[PDB]
Ligand binder design. Structure first.
Ligand SMILES: COc1cccc(/C(C)=N/C(C)(C)N[C@H](SC[C@H](NC(=O)CC[C@H](N)C(=O)O)C(=O)NCC(=O)O)c2cc(Br)ccc2O)c1
Ligand SMILES: COc1cccc(/C(C)=N/C(C)(C)N[C@H](SC[C@H](NC(=O)CC[C@H](N)C(=O)O)C(=O)NCC(=O)O)c2cc(Br)ccc2O)c1
Lengths: 223, 218
């Protein structure tokens, strides 16, 4: 059975999976769940994923409800012995470590900021607070890129796919001027053919956020 | 060489690693990082882990900065052929999925609640809001337990070790009376010899929290 991805491309974790699907030319059925319309709370989708989150992958009997598991699963099944999810144990653990950084730190903080915008309105959000928290993530990624060419090593891995989508979303608001490593890496990610899978959903998220939060992102920020 | 675990046993993710270490009899060198005194911001430790978080594992040249990676790494190196980290791909993905639920949902929401107690003060916390967020996590785990005795299937896996420590920390504040599968599971987890590794740090956190928060857990 061919994988089924429940998705809203405005979601950075969704876009990470879309990038991997494009990069590996995986044939996957797409099923749209409109998060703006609360379609993730439809009875059928909650029964499938009680966390009411996208991406959700159904591949045969396997139901994955987190992008980082989806990325790893798809790499193991369609990039057998590949380098995106490296064979050597220490290299693989480094990728896993940064995938969890995306869960625990980067996405958590960007999610906190974006949800404040919609619940409070942009003009009411404590931007300085979220700028500090998210600049802290910039600093950490800059430190990783100071010791490594890509996020998890010399070479493109799942960690870059996971991180770049959320990065590009943070960078809608907060400029990367003071982070030369992260600018260089981001530019390199944007040269990848697979980055087209991030472009469209990022722009749709921008259009949605500027309507719901009623504001305009600083256009100069985005790389 | 021997793995080194930087730790503060008040941390639920730390206790998950401590439980695995006891379950697998892993010889590790423990190094205490006092989070209450901000030692995670010490220059040498930030250099090691820019996320300034525990648990952090140093095993040779490998530096792991997240409990879920540490659990997987330790299982792979010290429990090859075990049931905690299943070799079969579908079973392994199901464990991984629940480890990420712990990062993405359970711990995130408990962290939000716990940080609000020490920031605003317990008397100033929107208890109802966090009770709603954390009860939702209870509901989800109750559903995960519908078909199985453990979170990821019929046998104990890394998902149970990761989740039980945060759950016991949530359970300081919200009982499991309404969730029969979850209460059954939590009680079964407490019968494990390895659960002793969770006892000390949970109580140390309770004492620290009841002191800074100026309240009592029921
Ligand atoms: C208050 O609600 C809200 C409004 C606007 C934006 C957000 C928000 C958190 N936005 C961000 C930018 C982070 N994008 C989210 S991504 C979609 C959510 N997916 C996950 O949380 C999966 C995480 C998991 N660890 C993984 O890696 O897969 C999601 O599905 N939310 C649905 C839900 O929780 O009910 C986002 C975008 C949109 Br257009 C709408 C909602 C979002 O949360 C939050
Ligand atoms: C800030 O003061 C304070 C006092 C008491 C309790 C908290 C608090 C928010 N506590 C909770 C219960 C959430 N426990 C944290 S756990 C330790 C932290 N580790 C991680 O966040 C790792 C998550 C990662 N995904 C993983 O799985 O490994 C931590 O290291 N924080 C340090 C930091 O961010 O600088 C906690 C406990 C204590 Br005793 C103190 C601080 C905490 O955040 C907060």
């Amino acid at each position: 059975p061919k994988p089924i991805l429940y998705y809203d491309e405005r979601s950075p974790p969704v876009r990470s999976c879309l990038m991997l699907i494009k990069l590996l030319d995986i044939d996957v059925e797409l099923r749209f769940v409109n998060l703006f319309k609360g379609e993730q709370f439809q009875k059928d989708f909650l029964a499938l994923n009680p966390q009411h989150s996208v991406p959700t992958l159904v591949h045969g009997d396997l139901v994955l409800t987190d992008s980082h598991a989806i990325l790893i699963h798809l790499a193991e099944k369609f990039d057998e012995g590949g380098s995106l999810w490296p064979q050597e144990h220490a290299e693989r653990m480094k990728v896993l470590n940064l995938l969890l950084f995306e869960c625990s730190f980067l996405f958590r903080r960007d999610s906190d900021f974006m949800s404040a915008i919609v619940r409070q309105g942009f003009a009411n959000v404590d931007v300085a607070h979220h700028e500090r928290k998210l600049t802290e993530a910039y600093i950490i990624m800059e430190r990783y890129l100071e010791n490594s060419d890509f996020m998890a090593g010399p070479q493109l891995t799942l960690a870059d796919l996971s991180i770049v989508t959320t990065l590009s979303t943070v960078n809608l608001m907060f400029p990367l001027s003071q982070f030369p490593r992260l600018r260089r890496w981001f530019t390199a990610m944007q040269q990848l053919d697979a980055y087209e899978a991030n472009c469209s959903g990022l722009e749709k998220l921008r259009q949605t956020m500027e309507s719901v939060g009623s504001f305009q992102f600083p256009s100069s920020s985005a790389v």
